[PDB]
Design a protein around this ligand. Structure first.
Ligand SMILES: CCCNC(=O)CCNC(=O)[C@H](O)C(C)(C)COP(=O)(O)OP(=O)(O)OC[C@H]1O[C@@H](n2cnc3c(N)ncnc32)[C@H](O)[C@@H]1OP(=O)(O)O
Ligand SMILES: CCCNC(=O)CCNC(=O)[C@H](O)C(C)(C)COP(=O)(O)OP(=O)(O)OC[C@H]1O[C@@H](n2cnc3c(N)ncnc32)[C@H](O)[C@@H]1OP(=O)(O)O
Lengths: 504, 512
């Protein structure tokens, strides 16, 4: 069945190589793509090869690459290998691009995901020369049907001078209808519109991205796979974390501080957040609803078991095997899923209005419950802040989840001082590790420290943390948030110097 | 007569007697925001009784939850009496600050727009007492607030017992200036759409609502608000304002702002005063305020017509300005709206209106993470206040500061901030008396080049550049380069020696 149902537009079909020639050195390129889903594939590859050739002849050839969130090997991977990206935003998980960023070869800024469209419209990234968007289909009236994510695609189509569409036959035609694309002003010039979403399952828009056909400079027929890593099957550590959190939710419900169906759930990036969902799929909370950034394997499992009724997100982040299950059963799942623009899924006003429960992973927290989501030793990027700030600050309850140690016990995930802060104390109420759960509500920073050290820290590190805190209480400049600045970052330096935070 | 409900007159009683309603261990929610509209006589009486108990070996402390900062009669008196075991969300009293920094009062500085919601969630415990200052009580038992709204409606809803102070010092014509909504802003989810699409829009009514059966005492008072002295702009503040106004002018000439700018949020003090004086004289028109506070300079622009409306939760005026507004309250009442702080500080509304946020800071690191609160990482100044509410939600987030503190002995730009309140993602523009750093579109290393070159003081720039250069060469990763062995060392140098500037009797890499 012809994917390009608008006859006139079929005359714009051309090779990926010729299409990549539309992209010039210095160009700002906005693309589809969010958590390994729905990014363009063939045009980036052809661009990457031409970049390598140009570099060899001594011609500069780099672009600024602005996305929804993370992409995949065919985009971030290929372009990073070609050394073809001078600036990248807002979120990356590709290892080659991460290495470019941590070597200082690609400039990176990890914006709050819900803010990226608004900053793009403001002009922070410069003028958009190109929008490169992957599509399932092009309707008879010229609407662009997105694929496995929505992300920022509508904004990039609005802003870009020229548009390139990759129509990917690999993507399931039955995705058509799953998306909700709103006509209103969420991220445009102030004053913005009221966004009328008052329930997580409410559709307010239409199934297609809109674009003036005169801006479409090329359409490329493609055939290639989305690719994501699988999730870790929940091990004893993740299962322990899920157990503590489910017990916690149970107590909240019994104290009537949550409804029996809880509140709309946001589940973050990563293996731990995913294991919580596996716990919920057989849990005592029925008729759950998701209002999230992404739908991971665990959430799809909850939809399968019936524990969750509907899930809202901007994207799928499915393992290879989960992605294949939803495609065989898109009829069952299409009615249970709404894919929204990321400036709507990650809207702080909507998140607060709905009363979302935020569950997110973390690199580390300090004893006062400030959280690092991003920068190992303070300087080495992992992935990026993503939507964790959008949700942590706006949520009804902000929960952070992590193994109490990393790197086989050589790093403590609870430290005297975080080497970088993404989420301040005010934005984190509940911490869970395999050691236990710290409920920080109502507590001052020294009271937070008592709870975090005693409930969450690993036994190998808890005495060292207690020693730091007790001596800080005695000798610190002020006693509101006691620190010893001579040793606050010393565990991190010890890791850099010796490969472990444990003293000899 | 200020109490126009006859039945409620029977609940009038002396401050001392009313204070006896407040028991050891009680959670007390009070009016009060930026030194305005807090209760005065009952806290004074309570403090006396607290001290008397303590002298006899009897415990007597409360948990004190407010709108924001109060004044000497409340935070001051109770701190002197050592009568507060927990305080939230925001304090500026010196005595209370000392209790907090000694560990004698537990403190948590919540985002101001979130406090009502967390109170309803139960995070502070069950409220035993609401103690609220009023201008008047209407015929149907409505409570007219005074010079701030703050969290008073939420505290009235939650408290077991209510005490009202009716203050004849407060102008009767304040009645009508407030907008109090009965909609669900901070209650149980799902909350209501807050339908504000203009800074001058009213959604509620003029009074706080409370079941009269919960009113245990009404106290007649006559006492002044804090009314801190006017902070006359010095040359540093005037330079900062000059760079900022030049930036606004350029944004307008590039069509990235309207000639009327966008709704403005500013703080209080030296620099904010200079900015407001600059706006009064600048090439802009039809300005609008959507802020936490009304300050002296705003009255000036509302009078001239330069500003069309100002929205806030409170007044923060000098004695001169307080006198000007009371002599002309009928005029200014038509130009000002005072809202609940969970509405003035609503992130959804701030974003929707596209506010420009202008906030102070203790320090920023070279990558443009910002400390608003904790000197050396451990000593509380005031609190985060509404700065997070506004910085994260704003159309443009601007931080303004002298480039040095303590007579040059501290750099306000440091290798690493000792505490973070506002992450890089929440700060786009920095202004000091040295210049303006526009960070839009930049990675952290690019932010550092701009902050060091534009904002740092000449006495500290070579040291900052030296840290940055060596971190670029040696850091674990190069995305946000640091040297962890010395990242906090300027702070420790200050703790140990009283200055961040080194001595030439030892090696320092920038010296060579
Ligand atoms: C609403 C949007 C949500 N988005 C976000 O939260 C984005 C930011 N968050 C994230 O990137 C992830 O949640 C985190 C923080 C990386 C945690 O991921 P996760 O729950 O899968 O954690 P997990 O324990 O499996 O570790 C993931 C990686 O981080 C590493 N890591 C985790 N904690 C660490 C620590 N304290 N020190 C060093 N490395 C650490 C860990 O070693 C692993 O890397 P490698 O595979 O060894 O190269
Ligand atoms: C929309 C809500 C706005 N609310 C907020 O921003 C609340 C948090 N902000 C604040 O408390 C204030 O903006 C700040 C951060 C204290 C800055 O205050 P300000 O702009 O009036 O600046 P100013 O230079 O007068 O300094 C205030 C105090 O902090 C001190 N200070 C400022 N920077 C400092 C630094 N880098 N190191 C040490 N002390 C510093 C300064 O010495 C003064 O202390 P004293 O009263 O003399 O003991």
């Amino acid at each position: 069945t012809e994917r390009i149902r608008n006859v006139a537009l079929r005359s714009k079909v051309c090779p990926a190589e010729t299409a990549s020639e539309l992209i010039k050195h210095g160009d700002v390129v906005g693309t589809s793509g969010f958590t390994g889903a729905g990014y363009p594939k063939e045009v980036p590859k052809a661009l990457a090869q031409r970049m390598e050739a140009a570099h060899d002849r001594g011609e500069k050839y780099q672009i600024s690459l602005i996305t929804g969130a993370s992409t995949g090997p065919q985009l971030d991977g290929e372009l990073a290998k070609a050394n073809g990206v001078y600036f990248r935003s807002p979120f990356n998980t590709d290892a080659t691009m991460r290495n470019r960023i941590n070597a200082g070869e690609t400039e990176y800024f990890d914006n709050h995901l819900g803010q990226v469209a608004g900053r793009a419209v403001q002009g922070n990234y410069g003028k958009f020369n190109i929008a490169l968007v992957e599509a399932t289909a092009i309707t008879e009236d010229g609407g662009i049907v997105p694929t496995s994510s929505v992300g920022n695609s509508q904004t990039f189509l609005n802003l870009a001078e020229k548009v390139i569409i990759e129509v990917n036959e690999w993507q399931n035609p039955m995705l058509e209808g799953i998306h909700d694309i709103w006509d209103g002003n969420v991220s445009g010039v102030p004053t913005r519109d009221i966004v009328p979403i008052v329930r997580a399952d409410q559709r307010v828009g239409g199934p297609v991205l809109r674009v003036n056909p005169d801006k479409i400079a090329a359409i490329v027929r493609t055939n290639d796979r989305d690719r994501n890593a699988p999730f870790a099957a929940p091990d004893e550590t993740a299962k322990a974390i899920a157990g503590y959190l489910l017990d916690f939710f149970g107590h909240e419900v019994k104290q009537n501080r949550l409804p029996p169906s809880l509140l709309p759930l946001q589940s973050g990036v990563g293996n731990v957040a995913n294991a919580v969902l596996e716990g919920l799929k057989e849990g005592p909370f029925e008729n759950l609803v998701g209002y999230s950034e992404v739908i991971q394997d665990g959430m799809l499992a909850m939809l399968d078991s019936g524990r969750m009724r509907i899930a809202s997100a901007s994207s799928f982040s499915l393992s290879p095997e989960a992605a294949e299950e939803i495609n065989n059963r898109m009829d069952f799942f299409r009615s249970k899923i709404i894919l929204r623009q990321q400036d709507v899924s990650n809207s702080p006003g909507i998140i607060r209005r709905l009363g979302c429960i935020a569950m997110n992973g973390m690199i580390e927290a300090d004893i006062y419950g400030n959280v690092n989501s991003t920068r190992v030793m303070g300087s080495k990027m992992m992935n990026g802040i993503g939507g964790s700030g959008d949700f942590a600050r706006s949520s009804y309850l902000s929960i952070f989840l992590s193994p109490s140690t990393a790197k086989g016990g050589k790093i403590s995930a609870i430290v005297p001082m975080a080497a970088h802060v993404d989420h301040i104390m005010q934005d984190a109420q509940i911490f869970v590790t395999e050691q236990g759960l710290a409920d920080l509500r109502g507590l001052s920073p020294v009271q937070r420290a008592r709870e975090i050290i005693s409930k969450c820290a690993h036994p190998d590190y808890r005495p060292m943390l207690q020693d730091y805190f007790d001596r800080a209480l005695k000798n610190s400049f002020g006693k509101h948030t006691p620190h010893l600045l001579t040793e606050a970052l010393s565990w991190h330096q010890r890791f850099i110097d010796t490969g472990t935070m444990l003293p000899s």
